[PDB]
Symmetry: D2
Subunit: 512 residues, 4 copies
């Protein structure tokens, strides 16, 4: 039961008034990405506050297409009060760690669909399609022959099923419709027609609204301001008003966490005019780039690639895409070239649209398998990791060879390990697989593992060590630091000297 | 083989040069809707001319998400030269009759997926998904238990398969990826980043470009003009440049057929300041609307409802959507409220988003089945007919009770049949089903049949005659004009007197 | 000396650095209007700071086209440090009372050209025209046969001359070019090309820049942000970059005083969806309006006219203009219809553009002269008072009959004077004239004086009392509160009954 | 005689009905520049048709701030029917030669104010100022000591007189207000509020509208389209609707003559991606430019300077402005940097804003006087020649040394005169002066004369020949071709060799 539209006007309520419409056992879908991107914060806050006061509502199911928050107490962490949530399906878990703490402790039912697939299943749910068929996730923990995307012991119901079409294997992911949506826009009119002029991006706001709407649910939308009916440009409207049931106006709405005023460069309206192991990894990663290539750099040790490219003078000769929608731009990013909706961005990725992608790793095993969704006893989830490493033409894994307070220095054109890491990242067998070396080889993909001391390539007989850093001993610093035996390439070479010098490399971008 | 990007710029070619890249047996996807909407005319023309002069390329497959053309010699009719096209899959067939003539004559393999499903399968193909699961089309000619969407005898290969998920029936539609795209935008930059500021709508341009791009195909895009790199607004860009392989610049590009100059009302930039049998049907159809309902712009006798609502002064109390993406507006419409891409519009329709849908009929049978895709020996195809009649809450069929130049006069608050139609439309059994009466009843839907002389409702025991026009004889003008016997409602009443008076009805729209 | 433009880039400096370029005895022109409108606050602050610390620069002349500030210590009040300013020409004086205090104490030379004329003379100085010829001010204190616009005893040099053209009297006003400008915009590119997208209005920013530029001076411009060269829309650029010598960037720049975040209704980008003595005068003033008439938004007791017209439902039937350039709109207005530069607005006023003009009064004498520029021993200055009262078709003076905490109660459809004002406003002879009753009659102008208790009209033989408020004694409340005897109209009536009733009047605006 | 605004709507009429409001002896002001720029063509056409058919209205006065037309039968040429025009005042005369033919034959009273001054006097008229005081035109034919702006014998009444202020000489130009205006915009709302989004520029449309409006006249505005009230952006509106009395809608309205469709590069909305005597002169003219200079390249042999600059790679190091408003841009122009209204542009010029101006000459005399307004027994008028040559810092006159079928050829680094001109352009004494060498030297300006064969500089003792083309004889090709003897510089040198070589000069623009 939703509040009625008096004279066609969308009901405007306080966030407190709005969350009173959430019943027990509602399935709530939360729009947003990291650091407050498109987050309906007042709604999340109101719901957390209501439960802290009344212990209602109870036993909600959460769908969070991507990870909200600050990797601490923001995002949907405030909703991790015991009894409020009973079940969650998220594309990324570590960004709101209070919820993943609940999953770790078997206190909630917990699934992780690949972020891209997840938003695709919400779009299917909008259309009352029962699920989607995709080979994204075959051979990983989301494959039912492994964990079926289940994150803990208490999670039992099979959502993902193995199916066959054209004599090929695919996964079938069940499409689940939400009952409630917390979405957000910059501005809407008196009938709820909404524009995103100052938002960092779009994500899958329309998809979420349609899925909840067509499930007889309540769409609640936070906006910064409301305007007169039919005065927005029709080509700027991203959500038709009839999809929205309740509007909350937050005149203090901020583009990102931190309360900074609207930045119109971030909005897209104006054109804006240190050698460590992380720069080293980003540098060697750039060597994998080609002229005209479409790539994706992931958060982590490689996210410096764009900067290195700018330093090297080749940043305009390829294009980097962001999983959530933005295309191009410089360090939120500014001077973007385009912004797609998140679902469409993932459709592109799934079909092998990326020439090169760069992903972090927590662990690598003898098979070339990579883990990121669980490590160190913690649940992190995938984000778009599976969507990106499943079919991209070249997969470039980036990270240090060891972990746990590793300290290095790059001086005199060499790598100095001043304090070796406590933890081996190169292990015999992954407890759980996020990326399958076997499937990537079956798909004909080119797989690299770039570290600060060593570079490997995946082959049919495992990892071949192809490059070794200056200042590093093969036996003591590499072979003694891995819990498996890599093939040593007969072509083994020192890593390019330029990488280790604190000056522009004179790198010239190859054209294939 | 595609032309190389020189200096990072998208290759710019004449239409003639561009079409020389199309090999024998390629699968060509053509963007566009009726009357020139988003049609890359210079590319269709050049391809037609090349075959006329050289009889190359040969044996192409065509995918046409919706119907292009003018119901005569434009659209893809120029491509109906014998030997050029071997195979076609279209969401609508009558808009380019030369192509549908080849289908009727068994000269080409010919399939009709529901337009909405068709564009969704292209989106699936972009993602390398093998097909989609949907209950849209169950119980109709697209059902493999009937014709499986095959339009003639020569068409043999099954593309649609019956599947089961959670003890429910669904159709599995195979996703086919094209090899070549003819797309279009208003403007692009030197790297192919494209905006649609002057286009009537967006259709599924991005979906088509992604589908062809991720199938290693060639995307060819017609634009009116090109601008300096990175000078377009990132939030206005609908097609990222890396999806585009060839740009054709047509300075004389027209929004619609007819050569008229750009109309900035049609672009969305500015706000614009007879009682016959068709108006009669549109008026009675308006009675089915209520405040706050979402309905669709109908094609045919139903298209006059908006104008009637305006006359009665209730046009702002509800919203009509257009299958191809536009939402709201007045008579290409102007003063629209929003424009979605076409695929997302059908996602909405499939999930039962329409409270009311208005559709024409060619034939109705004793089971309440409706036929429009084939009649009078001709292939028309569906357009969005199945996508809209499958799950919409109220299904309102509109048309005259007989066909073949029926003439009536509305005089003295009565209907006078002055020249009875030659052809009976209410027949015993449909040779081919576009809409299933049984399925609609299973789905809980409210089904009306509105004619100029009589109104019916579908019930479990068949059609109930509920209303009769003043001036008409039940026996001679209705019963004798149907090949089956409807149930006569015991509450049988005259159609509202005001419908038949040539003044404003003073109609008041029912509450929300 | 101005800083060099490195590679064509406009020098960017801190406000502190920028103000170091100001030498002793510079003529400084300061952009802005009341309450922070278009005020380069960092530049005023930095200059005031500089003088407080160093007692340099010295003996500056100020030109301030209109009044800046908050009628207290903001605006150019910080510049009222003795020794800093020696001379000032301002269009309004009471908005920055520390400066007018200096003028009252004969501490500076002090002139008041009418605001419209003053901005016209700056435009003249841009063109190196020696002065302007206008009949605006004839018969007032700005007329050299009176005070010549000199505000104190220390002010001696004649700036204004009586001249003769076409057998008519005119004033010649000397055009004085400034040496330094403090201007402001929202955004500029790297070459100084500036846009005003978020500013409340434009004022005379371009005029100031040209005047200073063509006088070999230094133009200093505060902006909120800077963008890449040539990325701003050429038709939004109000100031060509070659006019700008130094830019100061203030990322925290606020539309008005108060530090509120940018309001996009105020920017012009979006459409926004008690009966006391002041409302009473506003109501009676509205009676003077007619459909299609062009009026001014008044400053003072007149400012309520728009809200009364909205209450009465006739706000859209006429247009009110703002002296500083905005046209139309609702309560910084929002939903304006147009924004002109300030000088053009006054061009319009000077030629008799206003059908109706609403103005406050401090004093009225027996000749119907009005005084606002001096009273109660203080200098207020004119603002646009003379520009608007000189030639508007109807001149409607609005104010209470007495001053000095007059308190009234409007109960039972009558006026009750509960506390009489201590000061008589209707005196025998104005010591200094702001509006000439004689010149108004010569010009054929219709002149009204509306009070809470009485309404007068100026005639050839003096003020005629035409209306008396119910509840008021003619002798004690009116005649005894004036130092002259008005003619009592034979047609003297009570003020319209509805004015004194606390409900909507049912007022019908007179026809065009 | 003006049509009433029904319900606040501006009267919309055909051009034929519109011109019916023009009475005998009205003063008509016509907006527009060369080649159809901002020309209300339908209104000129309809007035011209009315007179051709009815011989009314009669004896109109024409004010044309600048020259309209194609130097033939367009512009205001259609208005040159005998008895229609009695009196004309234009800033330029050669652009509509049929009207100047009338002046030449003493058929009409004919004046030429300098273009800039003329538009300034219309602005002064809007404010009911009687005239403007300006030193622009001192010592030229507009000086009453010479011709007083009068173009023929029948022109008697004095409009321009000599005055004195600050013991300096000035011209006083009488301000004449028109009774009728033909203005134009792109779009207006239903109340006349007008925007110029697709117009080439703004010229002085607002000034003309205010001038006529405040003279109780009729303002007629041609637009391409009309829109709903209050839907245009207020910051885009250039003309407030209450200034407009009749609107004429021409849906076929073209940006320029020739009926080409709207060009959005010309509108300002998008960023666009042979050695003869003319190029030679343009090249030598470029030598006079420096980095950071503000220039104005004029009509004729100079107009090639921008292209030469682009060719030499220094086009972005200085800025050229156009007298009618546009600033910057490339070959109407595109990629402009800003567009001022015309009057404001001339304010800037009048105050010495131009560092360099480039002007054409018809005749030069021994004193360095230049003639362009009259030559070869024809009236050309000034355009903005006087406004620009009066106070600009450097005045570069550009032309050939002789006229009338002069053919030259440049190769082997020399000038070859193949056919000498019939007409000597360097004469003893100008019959009428357009530019005064004496006045320029008084004002301390640097005056150059560039021809294909010789370069001169004006000094106190006349023209110094400072440069001579290679391949040319001093006595035969220069001295024998002049009617006075120039001073031969002792530093006389060959014109730069690179000027006469068909390759890039490697020219470096001197520093700021």
């Amino acid at each position: 039961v939703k509040p009625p539209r008096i004279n066609g006007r969308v009901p405007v309520l306080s966030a407190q008034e709005a969350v009173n419409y959430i019943p027990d056992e509602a399935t709530l879908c939360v729009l947003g990405a990291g650091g407050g991107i498109l987050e309906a914060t007042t709604l999340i806050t109101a719901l957390a506050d209501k439960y802290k006061q009344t212990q209602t509502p109870r036993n909600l199911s959460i769908i969070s297409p991507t990870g909200l928050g600050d990797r601490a107490d923001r995002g949907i962490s405030p909703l991790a009060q015991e009894g409020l949530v009973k079940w969650a399906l998220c594309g990324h878990w570590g960004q709101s760690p209070r919820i993943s703490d609940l999953a770790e402790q078997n206190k909630i039912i917990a699934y992780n669909y690949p972020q891209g697939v997840l938003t695709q299943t919400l779009r299917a749910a909008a259309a009352h399609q029962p699920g989607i068929i995709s080979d994204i996730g075959i051979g990983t923990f989301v494959d039912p022959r492994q964990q079926g995307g289940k994150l803990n012991e208490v999670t039992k119901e099979d959502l993902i099923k193995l199916v066959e079409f054209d004599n090929k294997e695919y996964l079938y992911y069940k499409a689940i419709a939400p009952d409630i949506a917390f979405i957000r826009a910059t501005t809407c009119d008196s009938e709820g027609y909404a524009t995103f002029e100052d938002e960092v991006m779009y994500l899958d706001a329309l998809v979420i609204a349609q899925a909840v709407h067509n499930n007889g649910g309540i769409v609640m939308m936070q906006v910064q301001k409301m305007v007169k009916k039919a005065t927005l440009h029709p080509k700027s409207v991203r959500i038709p008003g009839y999809l929205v049931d309740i509007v909350v106006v937050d005149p203090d709405q901020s583009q990102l966490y931190g309360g900074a005023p609207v930045n119109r460069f971030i909005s897209g309206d104006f054109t804006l005019d240190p050698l460590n192991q992380r720069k080293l990894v980003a540098r060697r990663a750039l060597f994998e780039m080609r002229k005209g290539a479409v790539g994706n750099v992931g958060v982590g040790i490689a996210d410096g690639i764009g900067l290195v490219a700018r330093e090297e003078g080749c940043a305009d000769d390829f294009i980097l895409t962001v999983e959530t929608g933005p295309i191009g731009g410089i360090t939120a990013n500014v001077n973007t070239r385009a912004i797609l909706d998140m679902t469409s961005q993932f459709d592109f990725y799934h079909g092998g649209g990326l020439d090169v992608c760069y992903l972090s790793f927590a662990e690598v095993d003898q098979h070339g398998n990579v883990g990121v969704h669980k490590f160190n006893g913690k649940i992190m989830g995938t984000g778009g990791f599976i969507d990106i490493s499943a079919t991209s033409k070249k997969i470039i894994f980036c990270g240090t060879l060891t972990a746990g307070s590793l300290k290095t220095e790059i001086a005199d054109g060499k790598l100095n390990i001043v304090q070796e890491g406590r933890v081996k990242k190169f292990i015999r067998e992954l407890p759980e697989i996020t990326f399958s070396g076997k499937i990537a080889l079956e798909r004909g993909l080119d797989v690299r593992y770039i570290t600060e001391r060593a570079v490997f390539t995946l082959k049919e007989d495992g990892l071949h060590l192809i490059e070794i850093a200056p200042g590093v001993d093969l036996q003591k610093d590499i072979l003694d630091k891995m819990d498996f035996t890599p093939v040593i390439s007969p072509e083994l070479k020192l890593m390019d000297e330029r990488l280790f010098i604190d000056a522009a490399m004179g790198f010239v971008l190859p054209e294939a």
